[PDB]
Amino acid sequence: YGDLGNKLVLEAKRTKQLYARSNQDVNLPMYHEDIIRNILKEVSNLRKNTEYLKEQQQLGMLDDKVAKCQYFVTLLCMERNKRCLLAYQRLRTDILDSMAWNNNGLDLMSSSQQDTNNLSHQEQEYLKEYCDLITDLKSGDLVDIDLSGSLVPPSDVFIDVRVLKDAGEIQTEYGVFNLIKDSQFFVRQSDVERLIQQGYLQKI
Amino acid sequence: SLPAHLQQTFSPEEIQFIVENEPIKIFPRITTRQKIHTRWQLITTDDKALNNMVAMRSTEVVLWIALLLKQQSKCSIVAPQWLTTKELDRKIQYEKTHPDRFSELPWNWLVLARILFNKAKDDFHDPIHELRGKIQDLREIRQIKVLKGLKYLNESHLQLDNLSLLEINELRPFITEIMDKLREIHTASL
Amino acid sequence: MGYYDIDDVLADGTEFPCKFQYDIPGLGYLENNPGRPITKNTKLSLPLWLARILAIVGGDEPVPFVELLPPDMFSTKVMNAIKTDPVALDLHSINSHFFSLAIKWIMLFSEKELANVVSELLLQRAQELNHHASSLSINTNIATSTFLLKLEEMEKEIYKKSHESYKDTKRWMFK
Amino acid sequence: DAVFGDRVRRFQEFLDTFTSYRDSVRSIQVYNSNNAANYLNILPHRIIISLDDLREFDRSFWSGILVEPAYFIPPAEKALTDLADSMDDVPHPNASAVSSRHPWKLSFKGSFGAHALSPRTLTAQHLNKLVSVEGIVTKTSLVRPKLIRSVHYAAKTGRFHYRDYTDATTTLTTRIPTPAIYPTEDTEGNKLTTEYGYSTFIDHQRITVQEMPEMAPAGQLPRSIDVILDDDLVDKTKPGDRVNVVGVFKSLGAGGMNQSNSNTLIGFKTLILGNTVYPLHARQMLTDFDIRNINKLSKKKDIFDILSQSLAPSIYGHDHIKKAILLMLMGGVEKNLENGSHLRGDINILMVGDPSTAKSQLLRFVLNTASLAIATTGRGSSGVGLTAAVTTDRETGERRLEAGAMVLADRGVVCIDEFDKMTDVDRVAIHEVMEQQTVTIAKAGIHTTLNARCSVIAAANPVFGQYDVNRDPHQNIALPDSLLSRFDLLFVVTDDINEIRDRSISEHVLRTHRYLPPGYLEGEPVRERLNLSLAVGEQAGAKLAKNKGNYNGTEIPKLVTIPFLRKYVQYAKERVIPQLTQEAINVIVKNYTDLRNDDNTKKSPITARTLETLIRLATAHAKVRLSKTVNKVDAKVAANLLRFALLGE
Amino acid sequence: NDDDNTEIIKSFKNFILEFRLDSQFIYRDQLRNNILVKNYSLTVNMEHLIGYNEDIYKKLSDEPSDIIPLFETAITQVAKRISILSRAQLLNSLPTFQLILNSNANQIPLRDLDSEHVSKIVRLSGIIISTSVLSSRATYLSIMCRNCRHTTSITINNFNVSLPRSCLSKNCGPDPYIIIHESSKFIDQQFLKLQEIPELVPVGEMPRNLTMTCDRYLTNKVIPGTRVTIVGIYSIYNSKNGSGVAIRTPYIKILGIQSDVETSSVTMFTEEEEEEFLQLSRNPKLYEILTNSIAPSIFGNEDIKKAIVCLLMGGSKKILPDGMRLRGDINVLLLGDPGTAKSQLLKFVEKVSPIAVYTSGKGSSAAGLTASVQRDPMTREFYLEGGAMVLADGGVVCIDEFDKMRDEDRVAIHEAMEQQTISIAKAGITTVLNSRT
DNA sequence: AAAAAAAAA
Ligand SMILES: Nc1ncnc2c1ncn2[C@@H]1O[C@H](COP(=O)(O)OP(=O)(O)OP(=O)(O)O)[C@@H](O)[C@H]1O
Ligand SMILES: Nc1ncnc2c1ncn2[C@@H]1O[C@H](COP(=O)(O)OP(=O)(O)OP(=O)(O)O)[C@@H](O)[C@H]1O
Ligand SMILES: [Mg+2]
Ligand SMILES: [Mg+2]
Ligand SMILES: [Zn+2]
């Protein structure tokens, strides 16, 4: 029996649709590890049942055909439950890494879900270590290239940009940008991409 | 680049970039001949054309540099030969008289057209609306021919001699997947 | 065939008719009273994920423990209907994993008469898929949505990808 | 020109490829020849072809038939007639019967695809195309003969002349119209006398069919289309019968295109020429292993409880009500005597109870599971129109009777809700019918006795809002005693408040509402579907797939599926007619005497009718176990059921 | 004569092929997307036509019934130009394209229509009360003679022809012709009845009815009881069968229809409104933002508004393999003291619901609610006519003064609301009818 | 010929 496992897989598909329709890493859902641990306890029951069945089979009272068929059925049950659980976990890890890579490896606790408490603790430490790996990777031979930058090809050199949030004045190369609330800048494209990604600017 | 399924095909902006990384002709409005002054000394394009440049003469530069000079008053782009009414007329006649072969056109088709119509508006010797309408008619008939030819989807191969970049890009995810499914069905049946 | 593919693992859960060609005492404990053995030639609706292997192990006259009956999904009626008019037929009512299930079935059983009919099926439906994908609004009648609600689950990704590609092309073209 | 010959020879090749139709033609020929001159059924010259084979043979001819039947059907029937004329061998024929020249018109079956439509879906772009329409018969016309070819004779010439007439509705292809003027003079003036017995006449009937009300758009009324059919199948089915009619949908008539139009807003006339008819019934035959299953299950000791529990599994309680319903659906045999006139054969059940006790739901279940039944409500019916109505025919201009609510339900069962709320006047109709199972109409010069042997089940609520246990049963029921005495069984149902039963029924009902249709997810509502893939439809004994019936395991006792129960009742109502013996007679008379002289309070008074009810119930229970004789156990169970229905446990 | 027609056709074709705003030829792409989905029609907006050139609009407004067919054949000429290949020289199953118009001109009330509006384009609004069954019309007639017996074809337009006199060139009759029904082309036509809106009726008068005719794609688009906006031609047709002298009954030829419901009730919504609805559903206080929105002019009632919202959403319909039905609606009864604003909530509930009817329990009858058995005086046949509880199927019915309703009338609704189906048996008509509300 | 609304007994 593995029908419970199906309820997981179908649910995962909905999550994929959330990834597809939005085309943006945002509001990842809250885990379903309760059903997972229910499956774990029932498969532990299955495993102990297999161990006892092997015990009677070695005893000699049990019939060989019954033992072998029950062994195959139980092995298939474990295989399918493991398949469902790994199908869930692989998609979870994929979406985790996809949202982790694009925000410069900082996880942006200053602004995406706020407390990221809908993730499991194991998933949270995985996210932290992946951020560590991303920070480490661009510290090698690619120090002169920002990998986590934009991927839209550079089409124009001078653009108009409109401020979205108020701040003080920010130092730049040979200049200073005072972010007065609700103002428009006519500046270089290669100077405000970091601010635009952070959400402090608008109207590219 | 992952972004979901954006790792399999090219986005239109990438197509625009790869097209604009191509040579083009230019008539400069200024002079930068060396005194017989800062060196251009670029890495991915010959400087000797840019540095040894004199006004009102023909020279070849990359498209993005031409656009950058066109933003100021330092440029005058020369339109290609195929962007005129007398060439598009014979082209459309060729498509009309030949109902199976795609006419020969540069693979930058519709893309150089879009860029030139957007930016280089005041340098054309012909009205813009007429050229735009004729290009639309060309696109229309080529679309009809592509739709007619798409009916044959063999599991072995296919031939498309003279399709432009955008036409191939917008059709790849459908044709590729359908042919892959047919191949899988055939292979699983043997 | 992908282990971490969600559509495949969903499709593996469909139920197929089967026959116990070989008697096994003490079985059926997951379906009826455990103390009652299941007699010979007793029919159940077993899922694919165990029917594929349980009918091939044999165990031992190395006859398999179970025998798999021809499912009603692949029947003469459906073949006649699909051969008559495939464009107006709604496969979504028959199944949601029709194509993957058909591929699995034809891989298990070599039948040179299903591959050509199914090939002509999806080849004919691909043209209307392209026709609907190329129709971008500038909201629409009943025909297009009626067709879209007849589609198979595996055709939805093709339809969506084509629609997004055409939409991106139009968005770039008109600025 | 030569296209007719090409199509004829192509159809001849197709008939040569498939050898089944030739065998059918040979069989029909030999059967007719055997019926001719050996010490009344005659097979009509019609054959059914499966166009799936035609598609598998020649796609072009198949598409030509399915798109433009006008240019394709006539060559096919001509080729069939020629093949019949070559195959047959009658060296000594008759004179009048040899001139029939029946073209052997065809019938079709198989997959249609986009041509299996509904009366609402028929539009302009489906004209001149072979189609199949599903629906319910609403009304029919009269069978009137019409002429085709007249035979004329003149005494002097000795040569018999013949003239052929064709109309717009007679043939698929439009030809030059011909008037009905009898030719009475020859070219040389010889007097011609019309020769009856040599001319050709064919029956004619027009019927109308409408879309089923269930599959209709919200806030829309059902729509109707009209069907013309002649020759064979001329008097098949009746009003109130689900049909699937295959034929050609064509327009006819000038439709005001001539000068006769009074306004520009004129529409043409559309009409379908039926080729064949099939009964839907949402099939009705039984197999050998079906008989084996029925017999082996009837040999069980507890068949009646299993069958009773098999009715409406979602209704909690009401066990004896289910048993009475089972006995009613397959009630006792009718008795007729040369001196004793008529004896009633079925059983009627009446239920009265406080609101929300599952009476209408059980009645709806009985309607769904019955072979033939009609739904009726007390307030929305009128007794005059419930039995027979007088309406004028549009074609002939005369007035003819129309069958009422229960005349259509002859030999069926009629279910009535809000029985007490019906107007008192209309009740007399029931008083007329349930008395002798015959309704007599005498109005506007029509004198006829119509047969109606239906059984009536009714449910009514008491006069007060809730039943009063402390009150007289007579004053709790608004109906008069005259009609109450006719009903065999009176059942009273009350929802006594009890926490244990409340918990049980609550968990049962909550179990019912947590149900999901197979193969469909729970996030979206139920959506409509299309028809079956086939327009016309159609290892042994080792499967028991739908025999045992225990689809899901929730209890130790068995349960059987509904279609097998319908098969069982169909078999029982026909194959078994039991007889009673003296052993059951002793029990019947003893329990009647004991019940009559017990002298304690009872819900209803008893009389000689109750003993006749006991006899009918004993016969019904002798039928339920598939035995030809009545056992005393049937008498005991009938007595127990009556004692419950009259006293209570 | 023919030169002017060619000039007009050329003008309209130039308009179609040359109209562009910014960088898009809207009408050509519209034709492409219509042909791809098999919707042979085109929509023209008045403002674009006026902005392009004023002479074409002047000619269209002068004599519409003579000019429109020229435009509708120019459309199909352009469609054949831009949809098929010459191939140096077939199916050609493209009929004459349908033309649909939209406008924003000043509305004209029904009672304001008079003799000066004959053969003019008018825009007006009303309520649909009855829809006729569709009928067939001939467009391409194949005609056969009887004596000379040759073939001929007749093409018929729907705007604004009889058997030709004499034969085509021996000595045939006046009109020796018959109609060959096979190899003929037919279309669909439908009739509708329109009634004045209640708020625009003049003082001390009664509503007036009017007759409209639609054809092809415009048919089967509206249902009775829905407010609509119609643009069409107000013309007159004589009645030979039918007082006075030289009388002519007027009617309307439908060209364009706008409806508030937009025939939405499968999903017809595009992506923008879909994502807007999803974002609204993500609001964590949507229950309160909906409760506050139920009649913001009524103060104090909160549980009543919550009950009304719950009723408006409706339950979940359920079916079983055993065949039994489960109801999927909830019924709310307001039973209280006068002055507590009960009817003012009833009219607002009528307004909000997509399908709703408001009626009084006093002026009502059992036969006037479920189904009335009318009888056609001409053909003398019985047929069912819908009442008020069948018009509100799939919606909500508003009943006030429920206690003033007669006892005999109040009993017919029992089965209609407990089983959602009504059964009738009158004059031999045995029909079970569904009513879910 | 049959259904449905209205005033008076
Ligand atoms: N024993 C029962 N098991 C399941 N459902 C029940 C039972 N008794 C009553 N019900 C429920 O009661 C509801 C009332 O249904 P319904 O109106 O048909 O009943 P009724 O007793 O015939 O009522 P009425 O006298 O008002 O016509 C139904 O939804 C039905 O499911
Ligand atoms: N809570 C309220 N807030 C504002 N206005 C109210 C409120 N209750 C009643 N009214 C006012 O009462 C007036 C009359 O109300 P209405 O006639 O609808 O009362 P009702 O309770 O439905 O009466 P009835 O029982 O006699 O039919 C309206 O003009 C309305 O503004
Ligand atoms: Mg009830
Ligand atoms: Mg009020
Ligand atoms: Zn002639």
Side-chain angles (χ1 to χ4, degrees), chain D residues 416-431 433-638:
Chain D
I416 315 184
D417 311 302
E418 291 146 80
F419 191 34
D420 67 274
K421 306 284 182 333
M422 191 161 35
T423 301
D424 193 18
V425 173
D426 305 281
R427 303 179 184 178
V428 67
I430 312 301
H431 297 112
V433 177
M434 187 179 289
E435 180 73 30
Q436 274 295 328
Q437 305 188 90
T438 306
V439 54
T440 74
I441 191 66
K443 149 177 48 174
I446 317 302
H447 302 67
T448 303
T449 54
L450 301 167
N451 262 279
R453 313 175 206 118
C454 59
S455 174
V456 183
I457 190 167
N461 51 2
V463 182
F464 314 111
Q466 282 208 25
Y467 194 63
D468 290 349
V469 177
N470 59 1
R471 287 218 200 194
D472 199 2
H474 299 303
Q475 65 183 177
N476 283 288
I477 306 152
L479 296 175
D481 199 5
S482 58
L483 61 82
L484 293 181
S485 168
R486 294 184 184 175
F487 284 100
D488 297 78
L489 297 194
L490 264 171
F491 288 106
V492 290
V493 289
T494 56
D495 53 359
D496 47 295
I497 297 91
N498 197 296
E499 72 281 337
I500 317 296
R501 312 276 67 69
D502 288 318
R503 166 69 60 169
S504 290
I505 202 174
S506 298
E507 70 183 2
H508 182 275
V509 175
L510 272 295
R511 257 174 306 177
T512 295
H513 290 88
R514 302 186 324 98
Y515 190 78
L516 208 47
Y520 184 75
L521 73 164
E522 82 272 17
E524 296 196 25
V526 179
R527 186 44 43 171
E528 284 279 340
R529 82 291 182 276
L530 79 165
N531 74 312
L532 288 173
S533 49
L534 293 175
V536 176
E538 172 53 52
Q539 189 269 328
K543 51 200 160 278
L544 281 73
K546 63 178 69 174
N547 172 14
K548 280 306 189 81
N550 280 65
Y551 159 69
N552 190 236
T554 183
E555 272 204 68
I556 313 159
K558 283 186 56 187
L559 206 77
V560 299
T561 65
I562 187 55
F564 177 68
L565 165 75
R566 278 187 289 217
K567 291 314 183 295
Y568 195 91
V569 65
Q570 197 177 4
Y571 178 91
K573 280 177 68 169
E574 300 176 10
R575 303 287 195 280
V576 179
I577 57 170
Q579 296 292 329
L580 60 90
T581 46
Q582 71 277 358
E583 281 79 21
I585 281 175
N586 174 44
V587 176
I588 281 172
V589 63
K590 209 182 299 281
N591 64 52
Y592 175 66
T593 42
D594 291 331
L595 175 52
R596 189 173 180 85
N597 303 281
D598 55 354
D599 299 349
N600 60 271
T601 179
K602 47 180 64 71
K603 290 171 172 56
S604 177
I606 74 179
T607 180
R609 293 182 183 174
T610 65
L611 187 150
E612 181 186 354
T613 297
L614 284 173
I615 300 183
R616 290 197 297 272
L617 296 176
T619 300
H621 203 286
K623 284 173 68 80
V624 73
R625 76 150 185 281
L626 295 179
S627 70
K628 212 60 57 162
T629 180
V630 171
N631 202 283
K632 45 190 302 308
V633 298
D634 294 359
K636 283 180 170 290
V637 68

Side-chain angles (χ1 to χ4, degrees), chain E residues 206-244:
Chain E
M206 294 196 109
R208 180 174 291 169
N209 286 7
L210 184 62
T211 301
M212 295 183 287
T213 57
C214 59
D215 60 357
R216 265 161 310 193
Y217 292 111
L218 292 170
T219 74
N220 213 0
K221 197 175 285 298
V222 297
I223 65 157
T226 57
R227 262 211 65 186
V228 287
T229 293
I230 316 294
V231 58
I233 298 172
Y234 174 74
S235 69
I236 47 165
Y237 82 101
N238 284 54
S239 53
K240 187 60 169 64
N241 48 342
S243 177

Side-chain angles (χ1 to χ4, degrees), chain B residues 95-99 128-129 132-133 136-137 140-141 143-145 147-148, chain E residues 18 20 22-25 28-29 32 36 81-88:
Chain B
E95 284 99 9
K96 270 198 295 193
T97 60
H98 281 207
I128 315 295
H129 57 277
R132 193 176 276 121
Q136 169 65 25
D137 187 338
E140 175 40 69
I141 277 165
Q143 184 67 254
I144 289 182
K145 281 201 271 196
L147 185 61
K148 196 199 72 171
Chain E
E18 187 177 2
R20 56 167 267 266
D22 204 352
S23 54
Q24 196 172 12
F25 305 92
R28 301 164 72 137
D29 304 330
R32 275 198 67 258
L36 264 292
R81 167 178 172 150
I82 71 164
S83 183
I84 201 66
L85 261 182
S86 187
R87 291 161 178 96

Side-chain angles (χ1 to χ4, degrees), chain D residues 355-361, chain E residues 415 418-419:
Chain D
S356 298
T357 181
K359 316 175 308 290
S360 297
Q361 287 287 91
Chain E
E415 208 76 29
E418 68 182 1
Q419 297 306 124

Side-chain angles (χ1 to χ4, degrees), chain A residues 41-91:
Chain A
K41 72 148 278 174
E42 63 85 18
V43 74
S44 69
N45 206 340
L46 276 174
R47 180 179 179 274
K48 75 180 77 173
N49 183 33
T50 61
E51 291 180 350
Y52 320 130
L53 285 172
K54 182 63 62 61
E55 191 276 331
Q56 291 88 20
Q57 180 201 353
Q58 286 293 97
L59 186 57
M61 185 64 72
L62 198 61
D63 178 79
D64 54 306
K65 322 290 186 196
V66 180
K68 74 185 301 180
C69 68
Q70 296 269 12
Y71 182 76
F72 309 142
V73 169
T74 48
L75 182 71
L76 292 165
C77 292
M78 277 79 78
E79 165 59 78
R80 187 149 179 82
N81 291 120
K82 189 175 65 162
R83 190 176 193 205
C84 293
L85 300 180
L86 308 174
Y88 201 107
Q89 278 290 342
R90 153 71 73 82
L91 167 67

Side-chain angles (χ1 to χ4, degrees), chain C residues 41-141:
Chain C
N41 51 279
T42 315
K43 330 314 181 194
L44 293 173
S45 70
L46 287 175
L48 201 46
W49 55 264
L50 65 95
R52 299 159 34 79
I53 187 154
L54 184 61
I56 206 68
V57 293
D60 201 14
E61 200 180 348
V63 291
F65 285 3
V66 72
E67 196 273 329
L68 193 149
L69 264 69
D72 291 331
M73 186 179 289
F74 308 132
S75 71
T76 67
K77 186 186 297 185
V78 179
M79 300 146 78
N80 289 317
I82 193 170
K83 276 200 289 292
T84 294
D85 192 33
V87 62
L89 175 79
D90 56 355
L91 292 174
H92 183 274
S93 297
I94 295 100
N95 201 350
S96 305
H97 324 298
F98 186 40
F99 279 129
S100 307
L101 194 55
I103 293 314
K104 283 293 142 192
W105 177 257
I106 194 65
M107 192 166 78
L108 180 54
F109 293 99
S110 294
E111 290 163 346
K112 305 296 185 65
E113 70 269 3
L114 266 74
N116 62 7
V117 291
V118 176
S119 74
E120 200 74 26
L121 175 68
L122 75 164
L123 197 151
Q124 281 289 333
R125 306 191 91 165
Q127 284 102 20
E128 190 144 20
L129 287 175
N130 190 359
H131 291 157
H132 281 123
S134 181
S135 71
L136 277 301
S137 189
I138 192 166
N139 192 0
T140 180
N141 79 358

